[PDB]
Every structure is written in C-alpha cells, then in structure tokens.
Amino acid sequence: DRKAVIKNADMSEEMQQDAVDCATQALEKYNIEKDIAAYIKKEFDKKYNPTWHCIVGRNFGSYVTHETRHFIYFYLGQVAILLFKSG
Amino acid sequence: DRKAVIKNADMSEEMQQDAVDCATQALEKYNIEKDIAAYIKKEFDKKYNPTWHCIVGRNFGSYVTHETRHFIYFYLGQVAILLFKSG
C-alpha cells in the first residue's frame, strides 16, 4: 500500500495517525484531489471539531496560519496533504 | 505578461483586483511556490486584515471553509492561486 511520510507536524501522535488513516480511506474511495481533500476535511471536522482545511496535490506551496497543535503536512504515496485548523 | 483567469470568487471586485496585483508582484519577485504564497498572504493580512491563507501550485485540489466575501481561486499564467480567510 501507500507509504506515509510526515514532513511537518504540529499535532499529537494520535491525531497524526488519524490523519494518515483518514487520508488512506480517502484515497481508497476517491481519485480526484478535491474529493480526497473534502473527505479528509469533513472527517476531521467530525472527529476533532471544526474548522479544518485540506489541500491535496502533487505540486503546490502554501503559507497558512494555523492553531497550535492543529497542523500536519505529509505525503501518502506520491500525493502531498496539508491539513490544519486556522488561527 | 501573465494572463489572469478568475475561476471562483466570493470577493469584491476591488479585492479581486488587489489579489491579481499582489500575485503579479509575487511572481515577479519569487520563483518558489511557498514564497509566492507567503508574499500574497502577508500582503493581504496587511491590506485586508488577518487571517489569510494562500496556496500556489500547478497540481492540487482543496476543500476549505472561508469567511463570506473572502475567497478567490484564480490562475495567473500557468499557476493556480487559492487565497481566503477562514470561517
């Protein structure tokens, strides 16, 4: 299956694991990046309260402002995933 | 120069124009997507108050939750730019 590589995290270990799990479910179900992102965002809103934002892609850079302990940036296979709550 | 194509906006005309202008300045100065994004985010924080988030790239999808009237998604040349304030 897909290899998870966490690049930058400000987030508990448990929540990082839930992020990888949610992204793995999303990739199993969906092929389009915005749909993958939507699944992850919506699940995190339910599991860890709103308001989350998710970007999924192979080529992008970002500059965001996040709530402390609510940020992860990771690869699952070849796709990069940014998931965070705003500050 | 670069062609601006606004794909989806929830934002005043004036602010949409400032977004395109800021992105044009950013692309003139920087080549790396995260630096482009940082310039735009920081300028919008100053011009239109915090808190903005910016993604710049050629391949990504997103699912975010934004404040009403504070969202734009547009291309400048071949790069896509998402700029918004969180809800």
Binding site: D10, N59, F60, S62, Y63, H66, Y73, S86 | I32, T51
Partner: peptide, 11 residues
C-alpha cells in the same frame, strides 16, 4: 495561539 507555516512539494 496561532503559528505561520509554509509547505512546498518535492515535485
């Protein structure tokens, strides 16, 4: 408390 973060894909 809020923190700025930047990310950049490898590709």
């Amino acid at each position: 408390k809020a923190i700025d973060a930047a990310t950049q894909t490898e590709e």
